[PDB]
Structure formats: C-alpha cells, structure tokens
Amino acid sequence: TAYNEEVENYRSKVENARTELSDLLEEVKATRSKVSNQYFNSDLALDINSYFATTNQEERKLAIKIDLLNQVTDDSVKSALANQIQESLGGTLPSEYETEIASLMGSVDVAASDYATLFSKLEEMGAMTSDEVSDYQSKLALLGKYKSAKGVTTVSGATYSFLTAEDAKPEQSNVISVDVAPTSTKEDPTTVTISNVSGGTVVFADDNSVSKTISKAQSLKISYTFDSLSVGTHTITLDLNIGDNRIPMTYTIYVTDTADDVSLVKDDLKTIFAQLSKIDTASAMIQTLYGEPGQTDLSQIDITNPSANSVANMYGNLTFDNIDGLDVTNFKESGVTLYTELTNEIIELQSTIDSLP
Amino acid sequence: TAYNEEVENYRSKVENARTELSDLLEEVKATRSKVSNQYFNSDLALDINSYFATTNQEERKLAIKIDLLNQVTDDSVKSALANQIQESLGGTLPSEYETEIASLMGSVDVAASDYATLFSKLEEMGAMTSDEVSDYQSKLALLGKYKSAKGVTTVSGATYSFLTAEDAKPEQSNVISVDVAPTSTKEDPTTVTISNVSGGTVVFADDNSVSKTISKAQSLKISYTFDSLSVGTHTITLDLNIGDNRIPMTYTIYVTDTADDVSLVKDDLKTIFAQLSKIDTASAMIQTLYGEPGQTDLSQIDITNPSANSVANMYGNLTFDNIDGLDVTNFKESGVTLYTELTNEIIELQSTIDSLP
Ligand SMILES: [Cl-]
Ligand SMILES: [Cl-]
Q1: What's the CA gap between B334 and A295, in Å, rounded?
Q2: Taking a C-beta distance cutoff of 8 angstroms, is the pair B251, B197 a contact?
Q3: Of A169, A269, A351, B238, which sits with the fewest C-beta atoms within 10 Å of its C-beta?
Q4: Domains present along chain B, CATH in parentheses
C-alpha cells in the first residue's frame, strides 16, 4: 500500500543513520584518546556516564573540567610537555673552549713536583709567599685532571740559571813583597815591624814574626789573612814601620751575595712570568667551565663527569626541571579544554543516537 | 488514524535528531579550529567539500593528509611548538660567577696607566718581555670594561721599593798621611817619590807633585783619585819610595749596580706575583663567560650586551633556533593526524545529516 510499500525505506534509512553515528562515535573516542596521550601522558578514558544526565551543556562542561583537574597531576603534564621537546633538551659545549685551553697547555708543564726546587728558591729569597706556592700547586693539580681527562699534549722540563748562580770567591790570604834598606860603612841595624793590625792577621811570611832587624838592602814578604770570608766588605789595616818611617797600609775584599738575585732578574724572571701566566689563565678557564658556580676549592672540580650546574653541563641546556611551571599550566589548560569539548561531543552524539527511533 | 495520528511524532523526532547533529557539527568545527591553532599556529579551516565525494574512508584520510602537508610549513609548526614553551626558553647565568670575579677584583687596580713605570723598569732589567706587557695591558683593559659594566669596587695605587733603590756611592778621591824621616848631625837630604801609578792619579796634596826631598821627620799627605766611578771594581796601585825603600800600595772601591735587583727580589716580587695572578685569573674568567667561544682578542668582548654564543647568554638557554628539527617534525605529525581525523569526522557527520529523511 503506502505504509509498508515505501515507508519501510524511511525506517531503514533512519536505522542506517543510527549505525553510521555509532561508528562515528568510536572514531571520536579514538581521537579523544590521542588527545589525552599528547597532553596528559596517559589515556584517562573519562567515563561519560556520570554527566549524561545533566542536560545543561555548560553545566556539563564545568562538571567535566572539574573532574579532569582533580585527576591529572601537574607532573604528568610536565612529562607530556617534555615528550614534545624530547630532542631539544640538552646542550652541547662548543669545542672551541677545549681547543683554546689545549693551545695554552701545549707550552706548560703540569707535573707539579718539577716545581719544588724553583718554588723553594723563590721562597728562600722572599720572592714568593707560602700561599702563592700552595695555590699554584692546586692550579697545577687541576691542569693535570684536565690533561688526563682529555688528551692534552704538554711540555716536560725546564732549567733556570739562577738556581746554580755563584758569586765570585775572593782569596782569603795573600802575600806581598817590599824592598827595605837600612838607614846609613856605618849602615847600622834597622828594625822593621808590623803594628796596629786589625781585620785579620799580618805577619812576615818566613818567620811568622812581626818584627825584623836588617843591615842591608833586602826584600821582605808579608802574609795577610782576612778574619773571614763572610758576606760583605772586609778590610785589613796595619802600619809598616821601617825605622822612623811609618807607612799605613790597607787591603779590602768584597764577598757579594747577589749572584742568584742578579741572575733571577735578568735571565729567568721573564720566563717565570710567562709560565705562571699560562698556568693562571688555563686553570681559571677550566675552573669556570667545570666548576659548580663560584667554586674555589679546585680539588673538588670533576672533568670527566661535569657537575649539574657547571657551564660544561648547562650551556644551551634546558633541563626537564627548569621547564617553567606556567608553561605546564597553560599546556594542562589546553589539553583540558580539548578533552572537555571532545567528551561533551561524545555525550551529545550518544544522546542523539539513543534518541532516534 | 495511524499514519498522521502517531506517525508525525516519528518524523518530528528524526528532524529533531537532524537539528541536534547540525549543532554538534559546529561544536566539532570549533574544536578542530583550536587543534589547528595549537599545532599549526593558525586556523587553516580546511574545506571539506573537496573530499566529500570520496567514499573510501582511508582514501579520504590520505587525501586530507597530503593536502595538509603541502599547506603547513615547518616554520609555522616551529612557532607553534615555541608557543608551548614560551617561558622556558632562555637561561639565567647564576650570580655566583660575578660574585667571585668581584671578590678577586676587590684587591686589584684596573687603571693600566698606573702600571707604566713598573712595566718600564721590569722591561729595562730584562725581567719581562714586550708582549707580556702588551697582554697585561689588554687584560687590564678588559677588567675595566667589566668594572664599568657592573659596579665593581677596586683598589687604587701601589708603591714599589725597587723603583727608587740606589747603590752606595763610594768616594772617588781620598787622602792619606805618612810619617817620613831622613836616613841618618849628618841627616842628609832624602827624596820621597810616587812611582808606577795606575788606576788614577796619585800626588802629594800640597804641591800636586810626585817627588819630595826632606831633611827632618815629617808627615806627608797623598791625594789619590780613581779614574772613574763607573760600575765595577776600581783599583789604584803605586810605589811609595822613601830613599832606597820601595813600599807598594793599593786602594780599591766597588761600584755596585745591584740595588734595584736586590730590592725587586726581596721586597716587591712577591707582591707583583700576587697582583699579576689576580689579573690573569679574573681576566680569564671574564673572557670565558663573555667572549664568543675561543675569542682571544679581548678588545672585542662586550659585557653589557653579551654576544649570542657567549656563556653569559647560553647558560641554560634553549633558543628558538636550536629547537630540534625532529621535534618540529613529530609535532607536525601529531597535529596532522588529529586534524585529519577531525576533518574526516566532520565529513561523516555531514554525510549522515544529509542522508537523513
Ligand atoms: Cl665543583
Ligand atoms: Cl667576542
């Protein structure tokens, strides 16, 4: 007729629309799952049943949002945001820093023991304090850690003139010869003597005597000996008496103590300045790249495994933790809005599927 | 009857379902827009009409994906990913670096001009090369830039003993007195002379003469004068002749040149080492934090506006550009999948709405 002749097609199409919507529903459930994995790091699969009875749509969205915020932790969102920048996290220290350090170290000797004698002389002469020697030994220890951690070629050995510089050594004894003659064949005996000696011993060489008597022209040898060869100026003074003649005489020697001082300044100092400068520069570079910020105890600085806050580890490095909290909040808010609207849409799609005869 | 008595409710419900789905459609369009803004940085609003005729569903998704990939640039996705970590980008250099530098600089004098005299003396004595003086002036210039950029209190002034150290100056002339007596009232005249002089001038004080004749016991004054006061040992030798007596005589003076050398080593060197060490350490720290990696021309290092690759600018700093390309690709892939599935769902929802009598 008309109720079963062509009307059955009407109901069959309605039922075909009902089955189409049931398939669309599952597709919407699957994309809601992918949204949950992106933003929340898991698949919450929020159960729509709890909100299905609420007819007010904004009242329904509010209820869904409140349930999601009490169910998703900020940590989960932080992990989900990190997953979106998995490769970008972490930095790379440019290799030019190590290249410059190795250049400096190429002409430096890092074996601190080889400095003992040098540091000992400089400390005996008052030219370097004990703390300066302690610090250079710490910096040298650090350069060793770096050289051993990387593959740094360095130099080995050095000689310093001023470590073997010797002052002249003047002769402590000496001898002289004088020509004496008697005072006029009545050439009577004439007594020659050595009087008023100071600064040493002055005596005639053959007798060890200080008084002689002659009666003919003659030569006499006099031995004089300074009292010591200690540092400073030494002077002998005496009177040589020939008859009524008194001739004052004096001899001087200078024991200097400035050989090492003079050699240090003119031979070695310029080389010592350069080497200490290289040690200071390279050690400070290493300290600044591999030390915890503000670290002054160089023994604590680790090279092979840099510390968390070191420049070597933080250069161009966004860490999981330093991901700002506001970004996690806004990321959480984006996911909740998307998830809420998709859940609300599933509810409406189920409602129309249900309410469809 | 039955076709218009209760059947009209059937068609009205079908039409009410049709209007519900038309409202759901717009809600789906709005969330698809929010998905496009998150991942693509704009609202593409892809037009479904082009794919509406394709019945194969996977063939439809493929066509949509291919259209989206030829429409979204990787740069747009990069900007969208950056927007998700807007606050996390950028680092903060810990303040401990500046704190350590300022501590070092607190006992350093950064005015390089105040070093001129010191550097000039050290260079005259061969104790420092000309390049060492040029480098310390560069490092001092850099410490000035840092002190002026930050607010670093420093020290001003210093005195060095060895810059005014003077050697003793011995007397170039001197006089002596001898007691002469004639050789025996037949006390005949006796001639006293000065012979075989070298090293200076030796003459009797009153006559400027070298020969005298006496006839009675007497005192004579002799003036001797070294030839110069130049550096080194000077010795005068002569023979004093009294009758047939010949008494050799000698005098010596020592002009030393080691006053500044001795003072540098024992007074000032230890202070100079410490100050040069502080200059080297702090300058190297500054160089390593504010220089482009591997920069050795210290004049080019800018403090107030660090350079892009400086440690000061790259510490804990993920830049927009260093966002890895793979992350942008995977982010683009997530958005395209979500957008594709939402577009495909809109097509199916419109299809069932259309095919619904
Ligand atoms: Cl450390
Ligand atoms: Cl630079």
Answers
A1: 45
A2: no
A3: A169
A4: 12-86+320-354 (no CATH), 96-163+260-314 (no CATH), 173-255 (2.60.40)
